[PDB]
Design an enzyme around this catalytic site. Structure first.
Site, PDB file in Angstrom:
ATOM      1  N   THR A  42      41.602  26.125  54.196  1.00 27.26           N
ATOM      2  CA  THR A  42      42.009  25.083  53.276  1.00 27.26           C
ATOM      3  C   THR A  42      43.531  24.956  53.185  1.00 27.26           C
ATOM      4  O   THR A  42      44.117  23.843  53.224  1.00 27.26           O
ATOM      5  CB  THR A  42      41.440  25.408  51.893  1.00 27.26           C
ATOM      6  OG1 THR A  42      39.978  25.409  51.971  1.00 27.26           O
ATOM      7  CG2 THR A  42      41.889  24.314  50.819  1.00 27.26           C
ATOM      8  N   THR A  43      44.161  26.105  53.063  1.00 22.75           N
ATOM      9  CA  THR A  43      45.631  26.165  52.851  1.00 22.75           C
ATOM     10  C   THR A  43      46.390  25.640  54.061  1.00 22.75           C
ATOM     11  O   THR A  43      47.429  24.996  53.923  1.00 22.75           O
ATOM     12  CB  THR A  43      46.033  27.622  52.545  1.00 22.75           C
ATOM     13  OG1 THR A  43      45.387  27.985  51.328  1.00 22.75           O
ATOM     14  CG2 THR A  43      47.551  27.737  52.149  1.00 22.75           C
ATOM     15  N   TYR A 129      32.988  31.105  55.418  1.00 27.27           N
ATOM     16  CA  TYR A 129      33.982  30.703  54.423  1.00 27.27           C
ATOM     17  C   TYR A 129      33.181  29.952  53.376  1.00 27.27           C
ATOM     18  O   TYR A 129      32.804  28.814  53.591  1.00 27.27           O
ATOM     19  CB  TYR A 129      35.044  29.830  55.089  1.00 27.27           C
ATOM     20  CG  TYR A 129      36.159  29.305  54.182  1.00 27.27           C
ATOM     21  CD1 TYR A 129      36.335  29.765  52.872  1.00 27.27           C
ATOM     22  CD2 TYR A 129      37.020  28.359  54.638  1.00 27.27           C
ATOM     23  CE1 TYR A 129      37.346  29.232  52.030  1.00 27.27           C
ATOM     24  CE2 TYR A 129      38.043  27.828  53.808  1.00 27.27           C
ATOM     25  CZ  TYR A 129      38.201  28.284  52.541  1.00 27.27           C
ATOM     26  OH  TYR A 129      39.197  27.768  51.770  1.00 27.27           O
ATOM     27  N   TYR A 131      32.987  28.010  50.036  1.00 26.00           N
ATOM     28  CA  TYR A 131      33.867  27.341  49.094  1.00 26.00           C
ATOM     29  C   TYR A 131      33.138  26.198  48.390  1.00 26.00           C
ATOM     30  O   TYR A 131      33.324  25.040  48.732  1.00 26.00           O
ATOM     31  CB  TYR A 131      35.137  26.872  49.824  1.00 26.00           C
ATOM     32  CG  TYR A 131      36.273  26.399  48.928  1.00 26.00           C
ATOM     33  CD1 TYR A 131      37.492  26.082  49.481  1.00 26.00           C
ATOM     34  CD2 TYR A 131      36.131  26.290  47.522  1.00 26.00           C
ATOM     35  CE1 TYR A 131      38.609  25.647  48.651  1.00 26.00           C
ATOM     36  CE2 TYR A 131      37.266  25.848  46.673  1.00 26.00           C
ATOM     37  CZ  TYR A 131      38.473  25.525  47.293  1.00 26.00           C
ATOM     38  OH  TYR A 131      39.575  25.085  46.545  1.00 26.00           O
ATOM     39  N   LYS A 154      34.543  35.115  53.189  1.00 31.11           N
ATOM     40  CA  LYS A 154      35.565  34.807  52.230  1.00 31.11           C
ATOM     41  C   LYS A 154      34.873  33.916  51.139  1.00 31.11           C
ATOM     42  O   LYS A 154      34.458  32.826  51.419  1.00 31.11           O
ATOM     43  CB  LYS A 154      36.617  33.947  52.906  1.00 31.11           C
ATOM     44  CG  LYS A 154      37.618  33.343  51.953  1.00 31.11           C
ATOM     45  CD  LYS A 154      38.604  32.508  52.741  1.00 31.11           C
ATOM     46  CE  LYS A 154      39.513  31.898  51.666  1.00 31.11           C
ATOM     47  NZ  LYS A 154      40.404  30.962  52.390  1.00 31.11           N
ATOM     48  N   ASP A 155      34.802  34.387  49.907  1.00 30.09           N
ATOM     49  CA  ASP A 155      34.123  33.696  48.832  1.00 30.09           C
ATOM     50  C   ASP A 155      35.197  33.149  47.904  1.00 30.09           C
ATOM     51  O   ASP A 155      35.864  33.904  47.193  1.00 30.09           O
ATOM     52  CB  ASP A 155      33.260  34.706  48.093  1.00 30.09           C
ATOM     53  CG  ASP A 155      32.260  34.052  47.176  1.00 30.09           C
ATOM     54  OD1 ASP A 155      31.723  34.753  46.239  1.00 30.09           O
ATOM     55  OD2 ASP A 155      31.933  32.844  47.328  1.00 30.09           O
TER      56      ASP A 155
HETATM   57  C1  LIG Z   1      41.271  30.190  51.728  1.00 25.79           C
HETATM   58  C2  LIG Z   1      41.592  30.066  50.227  1.00 25.79           C
HETATM   59  C3  LIG Z   1      41.017  28.740  49.602  1.00 25.79           C
HETATM   60  O1  LIG Z   1      39.615  28.872  49.376  1.00 25.79           O
HETATM   61  C4  LIG Z   1      41.665  28.210  48.259  1.00 25.79           C
HETATM   62  O2  LIG Z   1      40.818  28.241  47.095  1.00 25.79           O
HETATM   63  C5  LIG Z   1      41.974  26.705  48.324  1.00 25.79           C
HETATM   64  O3  LIG Z   1      43.014  26.396  47.360  1.00 25.79           O
HETATM   65  C6  LIG Z   1      41.996  29.140  52.503  1.00 25.79           C
HETATM   66  O4  LIG Z   1      42.956  28.513  51.976  1.00 25.79           O
HETATM   67  O5  LIG Z   1      41.629  28.840  53.660  1.00 25.79           O
END
Ligand SMILES: *[C@H](C[C@@H](O)[C@H](O)CO)C(=O)O
Ligand SMILES: *[C@H](C[C@@H](O)[C@H](O)CO)C(=O)O
Ligand SMILES: *[C@H](C[C@@H](O)[C@H](O)CO)C(=O)O
Ligand SMILES: *[C@H](C[C@@H](O)[C@H](O)CO)C(=O)O
Lengths: 293, 293, 293, 293
Positions: A42-43, A129, A131, A154-155
């Site tokens: 996401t980042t 991942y 989300y 990754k949660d």
């Molecule tokens: C992992 C972290 C994300 O899930 C953040 O919550 C999005 O702001 C990523 O950035 O890939």
């Protein structure tokens, strides 16, 4: 446990990936003790990247380190499979995928099939991942168990019970929190680490929080965690994904170009206000000798 | 009021768009009384199409009709602007965009800038596609008013108060509901009609609900609305976006090929079960003379 | 269709039911064309009333009219059963109950059992008061069909598809919307009317919207609906349940005392700002001969 | 950190508080190492109790121990003030209140005034009972700091970030989680303990998780935590509030009478089914030497 940076993608002013700025940033994160880099998360604006750009990202970061989890997901499964097969030439940690986003009410069966197809073709360990807020669906500990082929998750969710459940139902999975606010807690509670957006601009802080918590200095770990939380909260005022570029420049001293619209860069006024929210934090951190200056 | 079809995109076995099947479909919808065709919407798997594919869909439907609203949104604003500009050589009804999806918590300021940027380059009227559940955000009547350049809105939300508010705060705006279940209601309450997924496979029914309601025949309108509701409900059992293909072939007689994975096609058993669910309904429609055998 | 007022409970300066102000309010509402009065509802602060006070409200209103729906629900089923039984002596329209509130994750079976238990002891027809936001749970058309004993339902929800489903699955049920904003729509779409909080203070407006819609003057009905919406919206600025008192005094010319804390009375400045918000609307309604002055 | 039991209120066959059963249960809890008892909480069906019954619960428990936090909140503020002032003659730990429930969208100002009113009259330390899903309101760390008079907080929410924020913004507040599933995590992360419904029936388990965690035996603590999670999940099959009675009798060997409908007792078959679901967990707990037999 580990701190993993979901690495920001620097774009040029004509909206191409700025490979050289990416490499400087990746080299700096590794030097400051970050364990692994999650690429196209996401980042990193993964959903805004074509498959070619996702691969371009991987190649540039691979020039710096092999400690990479390569995010390949999207809404064309053929493209995701292709990327998954292409990573065979890279000696990296794993590939990853979020759930198919946008479309509401996809069936469990279709979601499980999506992920099993990726595991089938993957030449590397595959990471979930998860989300729910961003993708519109949850792949919880029980659906992860059913899919059965994940090396880790990754949660990203505001519910640490849900995160702990991956460990409970899947004791050999690596279980990371997607939260910067939970570094101290995750390290104290037996979880495997944090994929922490804020480690892009304050890698020093996130590593130290984890180290304090491991030494069982929980009061000290919380004190520093709570200062890190204030920086997270400031980043959210004008949009964290935009603000992460400004904070990286601020704390680390190099820039990372621009985000890709509709993730718009902060303007001058926003930038000034963001800096006034964090400069006193930046002072305390220098005082604690976490930042050089 | 009008029935607008968010037309399905038919894909070949090797995951390209089947232009010829699309044209056959588009022509039948228009001949059966559909007023306009919304191209690259959710039902058309617009988020799953590259910009080039979104352009192919337009060119293909445009061979059949110019009664087109062309959806161009995505997470790369340069591409959306490029599509908007390319639509200048097509004498169509308008272009459209949903809000930027996936990324949560984008500020009102950024969302407004996204849509104002589209309007500023558009050679045609612009339609807001509001779909909060899929995109993660809401561009309500207030925000639509602030953006200030929409000719119309498609509001996919179960809350008709929200939908009515567009007409309340934007008296000149064309206001459609994105629901199949609200055709009788929308026609009865002074709104502009419905952009209805189920009009892909049952255009006769959706046009007749609308006509009945227009003639203030609300009891008969509701009776037919309620039968249609049962088909909508059946299509959700295995997933509506996949099920729409199977229902079009069943009710309309020709196939639309495959959806794009991770929107996976129903298998033979699911197809058989779905048909059993709608068999009795097809029979009632035939006997009401809405459909022929 | 009907307009049903969920009548405000006026409290004295020492926090008891003001019986006389309640009788004055109820006479006025009946004089102005309101069909029935829903007593101990949300607008009347039912959950804040002991069972004894819920009975006093019934007794007072019953001096004025027999056109009453008597809400009796709460978290002690024995008290609800006793109120239902005591209503045997009143020639009223029906009793009602919301679902047991507060406790989350109550089973379907336990919810069905709660309502069946009241139906078994009730000497009057039983109305379902469905309000998912307030009570934490939803008793939808299918659950209502399962319970099998409701004469009608008041559906307070932002989703008219959900409200229509009651009619679809229970063709002989009286089906009312709990919204003031849906009077024109409800009357246009074949539902049975509205239980409208806003009819406490503008009974003349709510009746007129309904009449205009019934006459198929939908543009006129909506113009007046949209005006009423603005009053509803003003009422939410400092909290609707408190503001309803102030609006009733302002539009109807008599006092209704106080709400019960923690539904706190508006202060002088809030009251003044509120009236500033609706004074131009009052002038419009007077100019339109809808209100007298 | 501490384990606090939100003690069950046992009712007789005719729906009155069974004082002698309550005393037996309270005594057993204290003897098994529970630190304090939270009286009239959700688990004790406080919202189903009148003010007089709430006071009756206090007196019976006070016969056994003064380690009591007395929950007094309700939708009649005068009654809550009364209970607060009545607690003056009991040498207990504090009083507590949840936010006003049922009514949606109460203003921050009105919520703040409610708690400050209770604080102004309290003869003891005041605890916030924050339970967003049950009450419809969140009183977060910032609103708590604004109210200013809380000695502690019970936060019943799955999002531990939210719970940690109380500590971050109010460093002197006692901060408890309302989760049974977060006992090991809470203790590991520097928080003050848990008000755990499951400690009614497995007080020995909850105290041991906390002790293990405190010893930094995180893997051992989690293994026990995870077994306890399974009992919590079992309790939710037929409804946890009702199941809690059956589980206490099963594990602790005395009974707690009846809950108050619409919290209905499990029937014979549900009880047998629930026992079969936790039987194998009991045997594991016997093998771990946590339980005898
Ligand atoms: C992992 C972290 C994300 O899930 C953040 O919550 C999005 O702001 C990523 O950035 O890939
Ligand atoms: C038009 C309507 C959508 O909002 C539906 O929810 C999807 O079936 C579209 O397809 O874009
Ligand atoms: C009926 C309508 C309610 O559901 C409103 O939400 C409360 O003003 C009633 O007042 O009881
Ligand atoms: C305290 C614990 C609650 O907040 C639980 O969440 C109820 O499920 C209590 O029972 O008072």
């Amino acid at each position: 446990p580990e701190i993993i940076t979901p690495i920001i993608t620097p774009f040029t002013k004509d909206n191409r990936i700025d490979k050289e700025k990416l490499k400087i940033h990746a080299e700096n994160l590794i030097r400051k003790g970050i364990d692994k880099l999650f690429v196209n998360g996401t980042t990193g604006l993964g959903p805004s990247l074509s498959p070619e750009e996702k691969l371009e990202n991987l190649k540039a970061v691979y020039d710096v380190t092999n400690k990479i989890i390569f995010q390949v997901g999207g809404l064309n499964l053929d493209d995701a499979i292709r990327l998954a097969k292409l990573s065979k030439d890279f000696d990296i940690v794993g590939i990853a995928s979020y759930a198919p986003y946008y479309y509401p009410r996809m069936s469990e069966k279709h979601l499980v099939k999506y992920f099993k197809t990726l595991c089938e073709v993957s030449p590397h360990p595959v990471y979930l991942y998860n989300y729910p807020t961003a993708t519109g669906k949850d792949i919880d500990a029980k659906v992860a168990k059913e899919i059965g082929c994940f090396t880790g998750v990754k949660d990203t969710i505001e519910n640490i019970i849900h995160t702990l459940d991956y460990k409970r139902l899947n004791p050999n999975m690596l279980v990371y929190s997607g939260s910067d606010m939970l570094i101290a807690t995750v390290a104290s509670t037996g979880l495997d680490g944090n994929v922490a957006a804020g480690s892009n601009y304050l890698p020093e802080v996130t590593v130290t929080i984890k180290k304090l918590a491991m030494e069982r200095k929980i009061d000290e770990a919380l004190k520093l965690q709570f200062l890190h939380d204030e920086v997270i909260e400031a980043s959210r005022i004008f949009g964290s994904l935009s603000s992460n570029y400004v904070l990286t420049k601020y704390f680390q001293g190099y820039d990372l170009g621009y985000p890709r619209p509709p993730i718009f860069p902060l303007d001058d006024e926003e930038e000034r206000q963001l800096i006034k929210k964090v400069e006193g934090i930046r002072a305390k951190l220098v005082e604690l000798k976490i930042l050089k200056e």
